[PDB]
Structure formats: structure tokens, C-alpha cells
Short mmCIF file of C-alpha atoms in Angstrom, two decimals:
data_model
loop_
_atom_site.label_atom_id
_atom_site.label_comp_id
_atom_site.label_asym_id
_atom_site.label_seq_id
_atom_site.Cartn_x
_atom_site.Cartn_y
_atom_site.Cartn_z
CA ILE A 1 -20.03 0.18 19.79
CA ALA A 2 -16.70 -0.78 21.44
CA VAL A 3 -13.46 0.89 20.33
CA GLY A 4 -9.91 -0.47 20.44
CA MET A 5 -6.69 1.31 19.62
CA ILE A 6 -2.98 0.60 19.45
CA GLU A 7 -0.46 3.41 19.22
CA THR A 8 3.03 2.64 17.91
CA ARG A 9 6.17 4.60 17.24
CA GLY A 10 6.67 4.11 13.50
CA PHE A 11 4.42 3.40 10.52
CA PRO A 12 5.25 -0.23 9.57
CA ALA A 13 4.44 -1.46 13.10
CA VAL A 14 1.02 0.33 13.08
CA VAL A 15 0.19 -1.45 9.80
CA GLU A 16 1.10 -4.82 11.30
CA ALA A 17 -1.08 -4.03 14.35
CA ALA A 18 -3.93 -3.00 12.02
CA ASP A 19 -3.56 -6.25 10.00
CA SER A 20 -3.23 -8.47 13.09
CA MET A 21 -6.25 -6.80 14.76
CA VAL A 22 -8.66 -7.36 11.85
CA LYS A 23 -7.45 -10.95 11.35
CA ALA A 24 -7.91 -11.83 15.05
CA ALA A 25 -11.62 -11.09 15.59
CA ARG A 26 -14.85 -9.70 14.17
CA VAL A 27 -13.76 -6.06 14.16
CA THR A 28 -13.45 -3.48 11.37
CA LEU A 29 -10.52 -1.10 10.96
CA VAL A 30 -12.01 2.41 10.86
CA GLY A 31 -9.24 4.86 11.76
CA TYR A 32 -5.63 5.88 11.32
CA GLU A 33 -4.47 8.93 13.30
CA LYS A 34 -1.15 10.80 13.21
CA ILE A 35 -0.30 13.18 16.06
CA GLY A 36 3.38 13.85 15.33
CA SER A 37 6.64 12.71 16.92
CA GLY A 38 6.40 9.38 15.08
CA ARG A 39 3.31 8.52 17.15
CA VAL A 40 0.66 6.76 15.10
CA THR A 41 -2.58 4.97 16.14
CA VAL A 42 -4.87 2.51 14.37
CA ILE A 43 -8.44 2.13 15.63
CA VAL A 44 -10.90 -0.78 15.38
CA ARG A 45 -14.60 -1.09 16.23
CA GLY A 46 -16.67 -4.11 17.27
CA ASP A 47 -18.01 -6.15 20.16
CA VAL A 48 -15.92 -5.62 23.32
CA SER A 49 -14.85 -9.27 23.63
CA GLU A 50 -13.88 -9.24 19.93
CA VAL A 51 -11.98 -5.95 20.35
CA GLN A 52 -10.15 -7.51 23.34
CA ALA A 53 -9.08 -10.47 21.14
CA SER A 54 -7.98 -8.15 18.30
CA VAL A 55 -6.04 -5.76 20.52
CA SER A 56 -4.34 -8.72 22.24
CA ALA A 57 -3.16 -10.07 18.88
CA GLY A 58 -2.37 -6.60 17.55
CA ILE A 59 0.01 -5.84 20.41
CA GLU A 60 2.12 -9.01 20.27
CA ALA A 61 2.46 -8.75 16.47
CA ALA A 62 3.51 -5.09 16.55
CA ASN A 63 6.06 -5.92 19.27
CA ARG A 64 7.70 -8.49 16.96
CA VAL A 65 8.05 -6.02 14.07
CA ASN A 66 11.72 -5.20 13.37
CA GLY A 67 12.22 -1.82 15.05
CA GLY A 68 8.57 -1.87 16.17
CA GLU A 69 7.51 -0.04 19.32
CA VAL A 70 4.05 -0.09 20.91
CA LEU A 71 3.57 3.16 22.89
CA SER A 72 0.03 2.88 24.26
CA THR A 73 -3.03 0.67 23.92
CA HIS A 74 -6.59 1.07 25.18
CA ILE A 75 -10.13 -0.26 24.89
CA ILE A 76 -13.46 1.48 25.56
CA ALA A 77 -16.56 -0.76 25.56
CA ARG A 78 -19.39 1.76 25.00
CA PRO A 79 -17.90 5.15 24.12
CA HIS A 80 -20.27 8.14 24.17
CA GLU A 81 -21.54 9.11 20.69
CA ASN A 82 -20.34 12.70 21.41
CA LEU A 83 -16.79 11.43 20.77
CA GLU A 84 -17.72 10.01 17.34
CA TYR A 85 -18.32 13.41 15.70
CA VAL A 86 -15.34 15.13 17.40
CA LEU A 87 -12.63 12.43 17.32
CA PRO A 88 -11.70 10.35 14.22
CA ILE A 89 -12.72 6.91 15.59
CA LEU A 90 -15.33 6.25 12.87
CA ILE B 1 -1.31 -8.82 -2.45
CA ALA B 2 1.87 -8.75 -0.31
CA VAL B 3 3.12 -5.46 1.16
CA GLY B 4 6.67 -4.45 2.06
CA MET B 5 7.85 -1.31 3.80
CA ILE B 6 11.07 0.32 4.90
CA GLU B 7 11.07 3.23 7.31
CA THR B 8 14.12 5.51 7.46
CA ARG B 9 15.11 8.58 9.37
CA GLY B 10 15.66 11.13 6.59
CA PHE B 11 14.34 11.64 3.07
CA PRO B 12 17.34 10.81 0.81
CA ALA B 13 17.70 7.34 2.39
CA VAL B 14 13.96 6.56 1.85
CA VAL B 15 14.40 7.43 -1.85
CA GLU B 16 17.39 5.10 -2.15
CA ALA B 17 15.36 2.33 -0.44
CA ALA B 18 12.46 3.00 -2.84
CA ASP B 19 14.81 2.86 -5.87
CA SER B 20 16.67 -0.24 -4.64
CA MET B 21 13.38 -2.04 -3.84
CA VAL B 22 11.84 -1.58 -7.31
CA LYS B 23 15.12 -2.51 -9.05
CA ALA B 24 15.52 -5.73 -7.00
CA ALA B 25 12.29 -7.60 -7.82
CA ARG B 26 8.89 -7.54 -9.53
CA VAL B 27 7.27 -5.07 -7.14
CA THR B 28 5.67 -1.65 -7.69
CA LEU B 29 6.24 1.37 -5.45
CA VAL B 30 2.79 2.53 -4.32
CA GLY B 31 3.26 4.61 -1.17
CA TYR B 32 5.24 7.29 0.61
CA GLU B 33 4.16 8.13 4.16
CA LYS B 34 5.37 10.86 6.52
CA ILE B 35 4.53 10.60 10.23
CA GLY B 36 6.80 13.32 11.64
CA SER B 37 10.05 13.31 13.62
CA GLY B 38 12.01 12.69 10.40
CA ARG B 39 10.37 9.26 10.13
CA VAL B 40 9.49 8.37 6.55
CA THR B 41 8.32 5.07 4.97
CA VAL B 42 8.18 3.82 1.38
CA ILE B 43 5.84 0.94 0.56
CA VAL B 44 5.93 -1.67 -2.22
CA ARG B 45 3.42 -4.30 -3.37
CA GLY B 46 3.94 -7.64 -5.10
CA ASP B 47 4.43 -11.37 -4.64
CA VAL B 48 5.76 -12.18 -1.15
CA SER B 49 9.00 -13.76 -2.39
CA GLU B 50 9.55 -10.74 -4.66
CA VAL B 51 8.78 -8.32 -1.79
CA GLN B 52 11.31 -10.24 0.36
CA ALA B 53 13.98 -9.75 -2.34
CA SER B 54 13.14 -6.04 -2.72
CA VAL B 55 13.09 -5.31 1.00
CA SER B 56 16.40 -7.17 1.44
CA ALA B 57 18.04 -4.99 -1.22
CA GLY B 58 16.25 -1.86 -0.02
CA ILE B 59 17.64 -2.20 3.50
CA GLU B 60 21.31 -2.70 2.63
CA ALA B 61 21.23 0.20 0.14
CA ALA B 62 19.57 2.61 2.59
CA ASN B 63 22.14 1.61 5.25
CA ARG B 64 24.98 2.68 2.91
CA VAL B 65 23.47 6.13 2.25
CA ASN B 66 25.62 8.90 3.76
CA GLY B 67 23.81 9.78 6.99
CA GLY B 68 21.18 7.14 6.20
CA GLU B 69 19.30 5.41 9.02
CA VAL B 70 16.83 2.54 8.65
CA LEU B 71 14.38 2.65 11.61
CA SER B 72 11.99 -0.23 10.93
CA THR B 73 11.18 -2.72 8.19
CA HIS B 74 8.31 -5.18 7.78
CA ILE B 75 6.55 -7.48 5.34
CA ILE B 76 2.94 -8.72 5.30
CA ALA B 77 2.13 -11.48 2.78
CA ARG B 78 -1.68 -11.21 2.47
CA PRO B 79 -2.87 -8.07 4.26
CA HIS B 80 -6.62 -7.74 4.85
CA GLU B 81 -8.36 -5.50 2.27
CA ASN B 82 -9.83 -3.50 5.21
CA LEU B 83 -6.37 -1.92 5.61
CA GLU B 84 -6.26 -0.81 1.96
CA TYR B 85 -9.04 1.80 2.29
CA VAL B 86 -7.90 3.06 5.73
CA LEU B 87 -4.08 3.07 5.42
CA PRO B 88 -2.13 4.56 2.46
CA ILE B 89 -0.54 1.31 1.20
CA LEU B 90 -2.15 1.48 -2.26
CA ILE C 1 -19.75 29.13 29.13
CA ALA C 2 -17.04 27.28 31.12
CA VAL C 3 -14.26 25.41 29.31
CA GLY C 4 -12.27 22.38 30.47
CA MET C 5 -9.31 20.74 28.79
CA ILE C 6 -7.00 17.80 29.30
CA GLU C 7 -3.79 17.48 27.33
CA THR C 8 -2.15 14.05 27.03
CA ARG C 9 0.90 12.64 25.34
CA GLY C 10 -0.60 10.07 22.96
CA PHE C 11 -3.93 9.63 21.18
CA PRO C 12 -5.57 6.65 22.99
CA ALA C 13 -5.27 8.42 26.37
CA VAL C 14 -6.91 11.63 25.00
CA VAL C 15 -9.85 9.52 23.78
CA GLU C 16 -10.25 7.93 27.21
CA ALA C 17 -10.15 11.41 28.80
CA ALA C 18 -12.75 12.62 26.29
CA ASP C 19 -15.00 9.60 27.04
CA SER C 20 -14.55 9.85 30.82
CA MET C 21 -15.22 13.62 30.78
CA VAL C 22 -18.56 13.39 28.94
CA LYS C 23 -19.71 10.43 31.07
CA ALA C 24 -18.89 12.23 34.36
CA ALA C 25 -21.04 15.38 34.09
CA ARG C 26 -23.36 17.52 31.97
CA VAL C 27 -20.70 18.70 29.52
CA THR C 28 -20.36 18.37 25.74
CA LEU C 29 -17.14 17.46 23.95
CA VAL C 30 -16.51 20.24 21.41
CA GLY C 31 -12.81 20.15 20.52
CA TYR C 32 -9.80 18.05 19.65
CA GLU C 33 -6.53 19.92 19.07
CA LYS C 34 -3.14 18.65 17.86
CA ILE C 35 -0.06 20.84 18.36
CA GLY C 36 2.70 18.35 17.53
CA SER C 37 5.24 16.41 19.60
CA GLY C 38 2.56 13.85 20.51
CA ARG C 39 0.72 16.55 22.48
CA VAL C 40 -3.04 16.31 22.08
CA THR C 41 -5.90 18.08 23.93
CA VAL C 42 -9.63 17.38 24.21
CA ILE C 43 -11.93 20.23 25.25
CA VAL C 44 -15.35 20.21 26.94
CA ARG C 45 -17.90 22.97 27.62
CA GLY C 46 -20.52 23.30 30.35
CA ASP C 47 -21.30 24.66 33.80
CA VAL C 48 -18.11 25.21 35.83
CA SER C 49 -19.04 22.74 38.59
CA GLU C 50 -19.91 20.16 35.91
CA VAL C 51 -16.63 20.84 34.05
CA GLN C 52 -14.77 20.38 37.37
CA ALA C 53 -16.44 16.95 37.82
CA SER C 54 -15.67 15.93 34.21
CA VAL C 55 -12.05 17.06 34.29
CA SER C 56 -11.54 15.28 37.64
CA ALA C 57 -12.81 12.01 36.15
CA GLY C 58 -11.03 12.61 32.85
CA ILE C 59 -7.64 12.92 34.51
CA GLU C 60 -7.74 9.78 36.66
CA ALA C 61 -9.00 7.69 33.72
CA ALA C 62 -6.32 8.95 31.32
CA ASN C 63 -3.67 8.25 33.99
CA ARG C 64 -4.75 4.59 34.12
CA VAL C 65 -4.49 4.12 30.34
CA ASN C 66 -1.65 1.74 29.42
CA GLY C 67 1.17 4.07 28.36
CA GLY C 68 -1.08 7.06 29.06
CA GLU C 69 0.43 10.40 30.08
CA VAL C 70 -1.48 13.52 31.13
CA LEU C 71 0.67 16.59 30.35
CA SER C 72 -1.51 19.53 31.39
CA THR C 73 -5.06 20.23 32.52
CA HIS C 74 -6.96 23.48 33.02
CA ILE C 75 -10.39 25.00 33.56
CA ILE C 76 -11.69 28.48 32.73
CA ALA C 77 -15.14 29.37 34.13
CA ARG C 78 -16.20 32.29 31.88
CA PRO C 79 -13.75 32.61 28.99
CA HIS C 80 -13.97 35.79 26.89
CA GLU C 81 -15.93 35.31 23.63
CA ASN C 82 -12.90 36.77 21.77
CA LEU C 83 -11.18 33.40 22.30
CA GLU C 84 -14.08 31.47 20.74
CA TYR C 85 -13.50 32.79 17.19
CA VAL C 86 -9.67 32.60 17.38
CA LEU C 87 -9.07 29.33 19.29
CA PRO C 88 -10.78 25.98 18.48
CA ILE C 89 -12.69 25.58 21.77
CA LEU C 90 -16.15 25.53 20.13
CA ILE D 1 17.69 11.15 -15.34
CA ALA D 2 20.10 11.34 -12.37
CA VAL D 3 18.90 12.70 -9.02
CA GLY D 4 20.90 14.43 -6.29
CA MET D 5 19.75 15.49 -2.85
CA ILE D 6 21.11 17.24 0.21
CA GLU D 7 19.26 17.13 3.51
CA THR D 8 20.02 19.77 6.14
CA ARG D 9 18.79 20.60 9.59
CA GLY D 10 17.38 24.11 9.14
CA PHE D 11 15.91 26.10 6.26
CA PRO D 12 18.61 28.73 5.47
CA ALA D 13 21.25 26.01 4.95
CA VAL D 14 18.97 24.07 2.53
CA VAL D 15 18.56 27.27 0.47
CA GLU D 16 22.33 27.77 0.32
CA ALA D 17 22.73 24.12 -0.78
CA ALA D 18 20.03 24.63 -3.42
CA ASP D 19 21.75 27.82 -4.69
CA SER D 20 25.25 26.30 -4.63
CA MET D 21 24.04 23.14 -6.42
CA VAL D 22 22.45 24.96 -9.38
CA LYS D 23 25.43 27.32 -9.72
CA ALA D 24 27.96 24.44 -9.76
CA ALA D 25 26.77 22.38 -12.74
CA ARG D 26 24.13 21.84 -15.43
CA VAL D 27 21.38 20.69 -13.08
CA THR D 28 17.88 22.03 -12.36
CA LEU D 29 16.39 22.39 -8.89
CA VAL D 30 13.09 20.47 -8.95
CA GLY D 31 12.19 19.66 -5.35
CA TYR D 32 11.95 20.86 -1.77
CA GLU D 33 10.72 18.33 0.80
CA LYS D 34 9.90 18.77 4.49
CA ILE D 35 9.61 15.68 6.70
CA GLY D 36 9.53 17.30 10.15
CA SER D 37 12.05 17.60 13.00
CA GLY D 38 13.78 20.47 11.17
CA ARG D 39 14.84 18.02 8.45
CA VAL D 40 14.63 19.54 4.98
CA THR D 41 15.90 18.29 1.58
CA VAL D 42 16.48 20.01 -1.76
CA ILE D 43 16.62 17.86 -4.90
CA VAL D 44 18.32 18.44 -8.27
CA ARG D 45 18.16 16.56 -11.58
CA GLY D 46 20.70 16.24 -14.39
CA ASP D 47 23.56 14.22 -15.81
CA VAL D 48 25.24 12.09 -13.11
CA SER D 49 28.66 13.76 -13.45
CA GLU D 50 26.95 17.17 -13.27
CA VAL D 51 24.89 16.10 -10.23
CA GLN D 52 28.14 14.90 -8.58
CA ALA D 53 29.69 18.37 -9.14
CA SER D 54 26.57 20.14 -7.82
CA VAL D 55 26.20 17.97 -4.74
CA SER D 56 29.93 18.38 -3.97
CA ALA D 57 29.58 22.17 -4.05
CA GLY D 58 26.21 22.08 -2.30
CA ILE D 59 27.61 20.22 0.70
CA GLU D 60 30.64 22.42 1.39
CA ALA D 61 28.55 25.60 1.07
CA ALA D 62 25.81 24.35 3.41
CA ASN D 63 28.49 23.32 5.94
CA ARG D 64 29.80 26.92 6.02
CA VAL D 65 26.35 28.41 6.71
CA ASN D 66 26.16 29.94 10.21
CA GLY D 67 24.36 27.28 12.25
CA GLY D 68 24.13 25.09 9.14
CA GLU D 69 24.00 21.30 9.47
CA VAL D 70 24.06 18.78 6.61
CA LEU D 71 22.30 15.58 7.77
CA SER D 72 22.41 13.32 4.72
CA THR D 73 23.35 13.46 1.05
CA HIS D 74 22.84 10.98 -1.78
CA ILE D 75 22.97 10.54 -5.55
CA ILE D 76 21.11 8.08 -7.79
CA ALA D 77 22.24 7.94 -11.44
CA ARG D 78 19.21 6.35 -13.17
CA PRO D 79 16.31 6.17 -10.72
CA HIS D 80 13.32 4.03 -11.74
CA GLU D 81 10.43 6.08 -13.20
CA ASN D 82 8.12 4.38 -10.63
CA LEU D 83 9.65 6.70 -8.00
CA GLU D 84 8.85 9.83 -10.04
CA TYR D 85 5.06 9.55 -9.62
CA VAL D 86 5.20 8.46 -5.94
CA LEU D 87 8.03 10.62 -4.51
CA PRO D 88 8.36 14.41 -5.05
CA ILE D 89 11.65 14.37 -7.00
CA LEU D 90 10.20 16.00 -10.13
CA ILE E 1 -0.75 49.09 16.23
CA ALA E 2 1.18 47.37 19.06
CA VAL E 3 1.52 43.57 19.13
CA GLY E 4 1.96 41.26 22.12
CA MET E 5 2.59 37.54 22.13
CA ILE E 6 3.04 34.72 24.61
CA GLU E 7 4.41 31.37 23.52
CA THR E 8 3.76 28.32 25.71
CA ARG E 9 4.57 24.65 25.56
CA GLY E 10 1.12 23.05 25.51
CA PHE E 11 -2.35 24.09 24.37
CA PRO E 12 -4.31 24.58 27.65
CA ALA E 13 -1.72 27.10 28.93
CA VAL E 14 -1.90 29.15 25.67
CA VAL E 15 -5.69 29.36 26.10
CA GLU E 16 -5.31 30.60 29.68
CA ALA E 17 -2.77 33.21 28.47
CA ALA E 18 -5.18 34.25 25.70
CA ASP E 19 -8.07 34.56 28.21
CA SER E 20 -5.97 36.39 30.83
CA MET E 21 -4.57 38.80 28.20
CA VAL E 22 -7.96 39.93 26.87
CA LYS E 23 -9.40 40.27 30.40
CA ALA E 24 -6.45 42.40 31.60
CA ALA E 25 -6.56 45.35 29.18
CA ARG E 26 -8.12 46.90 26.07
CA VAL E 27 -6.59 44.45 23.59
CA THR E 28 -8.15 42.06 21.06
CA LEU E 29 -7.00 38.48 20.51
CA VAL E 30 -6.20 38.18 16.79
CA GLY E 31 -3.88 35.20 16.35
CA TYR E 32 -3.09 31.62 17.27
CA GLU E 33 0.04 30.12 15.71
CA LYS E 34 1.39 26.56 15.83
CA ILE E 35 5.01 25.92 14.83
CA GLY E 36 5.44 22.33 16.04
CA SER E 37 7.24 20.71 18.97
CA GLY E 38 4.33 21.63 21.27
CA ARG E 39 5.20 25.31 20.80
CA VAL E 40 2.10 27.48 20.51
CA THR E 41 1.67 31.30 20.54
CA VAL E 42 -1.33 33.57 21.06
CA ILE E 43 -1.15 37.15 19.79
CA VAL E 44 -2.97 40.32 20.90
CA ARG E 45 -3.16 43.82 19.41
CA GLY E 46 -3.76 47.19 21.06
CA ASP E 47 -2.16 50.24 22.63
CA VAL E 48 1.37 49.47 23.87
CA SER E 49 0.62 50.25 27.53
CA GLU E 50 -2.51 48.06 27.30
CA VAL E 51 -0.53 45.26 25.61
CA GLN E 52 2.06 45.52 28.42
CA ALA E 53 -0.73 45.07 31.02
CA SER E 54 -2.23 42.12 29.11
CA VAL E 55 1.07 40.34 28.55
CA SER E 56 1.99 40.83 32.23
CA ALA E 57 -1.27 39.17 33.32
CA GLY E 58 -1.06 36.56 30.57
CA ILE E 59 2.34 35.34 31.71
CA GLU E 60 1.59 34.89 35.42
CA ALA E 61 -1.69 33.08 34.65
CA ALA E 62 -0.08 30.69 32.14
CA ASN E 63 2.69 29.96 34.68
CA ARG E 64 0.07 28.82 37.23
CA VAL E 65 -1.61 26.41 34.79
CA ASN E 66 -1.11 22.77 35.86
CA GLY E 67 1.72 21.56 33.62
CA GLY E 68 1.87 25.01 32.00
CA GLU E 69 5.14 26.29 30.53
CA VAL E 70 5.75 29.76 29.09
CA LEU E 71 8.58 29.53 26.51
CA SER E 72 8.90 33.07 25.18
CA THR E 73 7.11 36.41 25.39
CA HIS E 74 7.58 39.64 23.45
CA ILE E 75 6.02 43.02 22.68
CA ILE E 76 6.47 45.28 19.64
CA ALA E 77 4.97 48.79 19.91
CA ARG E 78 4.69 49.84 16.24
CA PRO E 79 5.42 46.85 14.01
CA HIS E 80 5.97 47.56 10.30
CA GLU E 81 2.86 46.89 8.17
CA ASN E 82 5.05 44.65 5.93
CA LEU E 83 4.85 42.01 8.69
CA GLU E 84 1.03 42.11 8.74
CA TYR E 85 0.59 40.54 5.28
CA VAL E 86 3.43 37.99 5.71
CA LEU E 87 3.04 36.87 9.35
CA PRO E 88 -0.29 35.83 10.97
CA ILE E 89 -0.50 38.63 13.57
CA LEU E 90 -3.79 40.05 12.26
CA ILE F 1 17.97 40.10 -6.00
CA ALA F 2 19.75 39.40 -2.68
CA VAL F 3 18.10 37.22 -0.03
CA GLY F 4 18.54 37.29 3.74
CA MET F 5 17.13 34.92 6.32
CA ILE F 6 17.09 34.44 10.06
CA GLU F 7 15.93 31.20 11.61
CA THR F 8 14.84 31.18 15.26
CA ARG F 9 13.52 28.63 17.68
CA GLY F 10 10.11 30.07 18.60
CA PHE F 11 7.56 32.33 16.92
CA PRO F 12 7.78 35.62 18.90
CA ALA F 13 11.54 35.90 18.22
CA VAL F 14 11.04 35.37 14.44
CA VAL F 15 8.51 38.24 14.45
CA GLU F 16 10.98 40.52 16.23
CA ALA F 17 13.67 39.56 13.68
CA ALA F 18 11.21 40.26 10.85
CA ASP F 19 10.31 43.67 12.35
CA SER F 20 13.93 44.61 13.10
CA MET F 21 15.07 43.56 9.60
CA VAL F 22 12.54 45.72 7.71
CA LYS F 23 13.17 48.71 10.00
CA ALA F 24 16.97 48.51 9.55
CA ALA F 25 17.34 48.85 5.76
CA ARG F 26 15.63 49.05 2.37
CA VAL F 27 14.44 45.45 2.29
CA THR F 28 10.98 43.89 2.01
CA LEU F 29 9.77 40.95 4.09
CA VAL F 30 8.60 38.30 1.61
CA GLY F 31 8.61 34.95 3.42
CA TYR F 32 7.78 33.03 6.56
CA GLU F 33 8.67 29.32 6.57
CA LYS F 34 7.91 26.62 9.15
CA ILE F 35 9.85 23.34 9.01
CA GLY F 36 8.85 21.80 12.35
CA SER F 37 10.64 21.30 15.67
CA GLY F 38 9.95 24.94 16.60
CA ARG F 39 12.26 26.05 13.78
CA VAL F 40 10.94 29.10 11.96
CA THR F 41 12.57 31.41 9.36
CA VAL F 42 11.72 34.88 8.08
CA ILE F 43 13.13 35.96 4.71
CA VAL F 44 13.87 39.43 3.29
CA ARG F 45 14.87 40.62 -0.19
CA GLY F 46 16.85 43.66 -1.31
CA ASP F 47 20.27 45.02 -2.17
CA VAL F 48 23.05 42.92 -0.60
CA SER F 49 24.47 45.76 1.51
CA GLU F 50 20.93 46.57 2.70
CA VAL F 51 20.24 42.88 3.47
CA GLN F 52 23.52 42.79 5.45
CA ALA F 53 22.34 45.78 7.54
CA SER F 54 18.89 44.23 8.09
CA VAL F 55 20.19 40.79 9.04
CA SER F 56 22.72 42.38 11.42
CA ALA F 57 19.93 44.25 13.22
CA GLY F 58 17.56 41.29 13.00
CA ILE F 59 19.96 38.99 14.81
CA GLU F 60 20.78 41.21 17.79
CA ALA F 61 17.09 42.04 18.32
CA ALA F 62 15.98 38.39 18.19
CA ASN F 63 18.77 37.50 20.66
CA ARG F 64 17.34 39.99 23.18
CA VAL F 65 13.81 38.56 22.98
CA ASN F 66 12.79 36.87 26.26
CA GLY F 67 13.31 33.17 25.57
CA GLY F 68 14.48 34.02 22.04
CA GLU F 69 16.92 31.74 20.22
CA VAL F 70 18.53 32.39 16.83
CA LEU F 71 19.40 29.02 15.23
CA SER F 72 20.86 29.97 11.85
CA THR F 73 21.32 33.02 9.65
CA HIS F 74 22.47 33.40 6.05
CA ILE F 75 22.70 35.79 3.12
CA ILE F 76 22.87 35.08 -0.62
CA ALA F 77 23.66 38.07 -2.87
CA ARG F 78 22.40 36.87 -6.28
CA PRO F 79 20.45 33.63 -5.84
CA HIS F 80 19.62 31.68 -9.01
CA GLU F 81 16.04 32.27 -10.25
CA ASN F 82 15.56 28.45 -10.27
CA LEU F 83 15.26 28.66 -6.46
CA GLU F 84 12.49 31.29 -6.65
CA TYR F 85 9.87 28.93 -8.13
CA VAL F 86 10.87 25.92 -5.96
CA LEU F 87 11.58 27.52 -2.55
CA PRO F 88 9.28 30.04 -0.80
CA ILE F 89 11.68 33.03 -0.81
CA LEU F 90 9.38 35.28 -2.87
#
């Protein structure tokens, strides 16, 4: 199933992105990843058109957070199931 | 229920924010998150108007801490319960 | 067996690299390593010519990720089995 | 009970602060927190006037450490007990 | 027994150093240490002249890795056994 | 008992400091602490005059490590036993 992710610098902005993503389309929040250097990603799963709508809303909400910084965003439509048991996206 | 969060650079300032937030309104401190790079967030839950009063007081106290730096602050009024079992806000 | 790895700055770009690598050749994703400072590597195993095709595709996909940054890439054709029980490449 | 904390950049300077704090007043060292980026805090508890005397001595000792850097210092006199079970200050 | 170590910035370059070290002399890879800030070290043990040959080959291979950076290298010929149970070199 | 500590930037240089300290006086290596940002400390215990001799030798050896950087050094002669059960110096 399709995967969407928004990476911010800072925790409060990632939470806003995570809230705005789930409220914007039929997606479920499945993942929260921390890789250091203040870089934090939230991950959603769903239909690709729904994930597109969630990520769109997630980005513009996280941008408006006080001291919020979006670092990177990305969507994959049909990720290989090999990723699912190696990377924390589910 | 509503969520409020203040992210500082440095530990002592996050503790002051956490103390000033709980003392400023009917909220309960539920979370302390560390994402690296000296970035640390404390999280409170309560009624949105109470969370607004706590966050307001939390910010101006943390700012007055010696070597204190507030990085980002944010309030969500009715976060989706999907966040609660993925992100450490409860 | 041959090992290929792509290191990015940021999580979403590493996931794209990991997806693009597995979809580009007969390789299996075996590893995801985090060393701090936003530096994250995904690792694939397979035949050397297949790993070359995967890494090639992995790099140009990760480069096109919004806010994606490839830091370092490398392929070893017949790594010593001593590495396999010390480093997380399998 | 009152809480005092000194955050340094570097480990040896935090240990000197921790030693100088306990030797300067009736306080007990209860906490050592690491938040990344070389930022490290030691925490003492006691009477507020005692904590003031400890923190005063802690700061000027840590400053004289070779390559020592104090980042932030702070004292709370009667922190809310809500903090005690969320933050590592006891 | 003698210890050799190469520290790189980045994971793929440390793996190349680790592979090139074991393939260059009678040494065994025993250690992989992560200290943050992208700084990563691989450690080999063996005869000092063998460790010298491995480290020599490890360095020039890691240097040729795409985006590879060697930060620090060092050899000790007869380290004290006190180190062995405190530091992860065995 | 007296405590001595040398903090370096990088792992190989901390190991050299740890080896040079134990070989320079009647001290025992007891601790290895990692606080992020490449900052790493080794800690020795012993008589204060012995710790002085070890730290002296530890510093000039770590300085001569290829890419070695000493960040901070410090000695306490009679640290309070309160530190021993809060900080990893024993």
C-alpha cells in the first residue's frame, strides 16, 4: 500500500504534520522515526491519492508551526514489501 | 483532549517550561521527548483554553532561564487518537 | 555475496533509495543503519552486476526526493565473511 | 523540594559541577541527563538556599575546568510533583 | 595483542575500511563503534606488522569511497588488558 | 579515591588516552562515556599524584594521534561518593 512521509526539524512540527495528515484523508499514521540531528519523520499509509491529499495538508500545517521546519517530504505509491520488514514504515 | 508542547534547546529550560506550564493552568504533564541535537520537548494535555494559558506561561519562563532557548511551540486542540498510540504525547 | 549501500541525509530519501534499489535488480534489502547526524544508510545484497544496477537506480531516485541528499555510496563485490558478524550488513 | 541544575558542554566539566555542588551545601545529587550534542546536565535537590549555594559553587568550578563550558543553569524552589514522574530529576 | 582502528565520517566508508583491512593482512575484525555525529570506527586485532599493513590498505580504500571521509586512524601494539573489559575493542 | 578524565573528539584518540593513562601510573581504567557529537571520555581512578601522571601522559599521547583532538581534561582528588552512584565513574 502507498506510503507518505514528512520529515521536520523539531518534534512539535512533526506532531502537527502527523495530525494534519490523518485529518486530511483516509490514511493511518503508522510510524515515527528519529535519526538524530533534530530530524524526525512521521509516516502514513493508504491509497496514493489519499496519501497525496494528506501529505499536501501535512506540509502546509507543519510550515505554519511556530519555529517549524519541514526538511523533506516524499510519497511512494506501491513500495516493495521487502522494505516493510527492514524499515519502520508499518 | 488538547495537546500543548514547548521545545527548547537544553534540558534545564525544558524543566522550567514543564514546571511553569503545570503551575499556570489545569493541565497535566504527560511527555518528555528527546530527538537529539540538544532539542528537547515537554508535552501537556488539557482543555484548549487551559493549554493556551500554560503554554503562554511556559514560553516566557523558559525564555528567562539563564542560557535558555525556546526553539518551537505548538498547540493542537483535538488531536486524532491515531497519534496517541504512535507518538509519545500520552 | 556482493553488498551495496547508499547513505543519505534524511529518512524519506533513504526509503526511496531502498525502494528504488530492490525494484531495479535481483537484490534483497537486508539492512538499515543509523549513525547519527541525520546520516542513514540502506544496504542491499546480491550479484555484483545486479547490485550495480540497483545502486545506480537508487542514487538517481534519492537525488530527486524533495529535500533528499545522497551523502555516500559504495559497492563491495565479495566482502569478507568476518564483516558479516561484526557489521549489520545481513 | 527545590531543584538545581547545571548544564555543560562536555562530560568532565559536568562531573566537576556535580562534585562542587554536593560539597558546597546540604544537597544530594540525584540526576544525570544526556540530551545529545555534547549537552549534559547534573541535577541536585535540597533546600532552596542550599541549592543556591551549591549551584553558585558548581558554576564557577565548571568554568575553571580545562575546556569546560557551562551552557545553562537554573533553579526551581518548589517544582510541581507532576514533573517528578515525567522528568528524571529524582 | 595489537589493535588497529580507522574512524570515518559515514557508514559505507567504514565498511570498505573494514573489508580492506581484513583482506590486507592476518588480522580479525572485532569491533564497530558509533559515537555520534556520523563518526564511526572499525577495529582490528593482530600482530603489529600485520595491523600496520591492514590499516595502510584500509585508509587508502576508504579515501576512494564516493563521499568517503577518514577522520582518524591509530595503532597500538600491546594495549593494556584493562582497556579490553572497558572499551569495545574485543 | 581520585578521578581523572580525558575527553576527546573521536574514538581512536580516546583509546590511546586510555592506554597511555594506565601505562603511565598506578591507576585503573574504570569508565568510558559517550555524550554525543563525537565527544567521548575515558576515566581512571587512583592516587591523585598517580592520576596526575596518567592524565599528563594521556593528553600528550592523544594529541599525537592522527586526527586526534583532546577537548577537555580534569582531575578531582577526593570526589564525593554521591557522584559514584549517579555518574558512571566507577
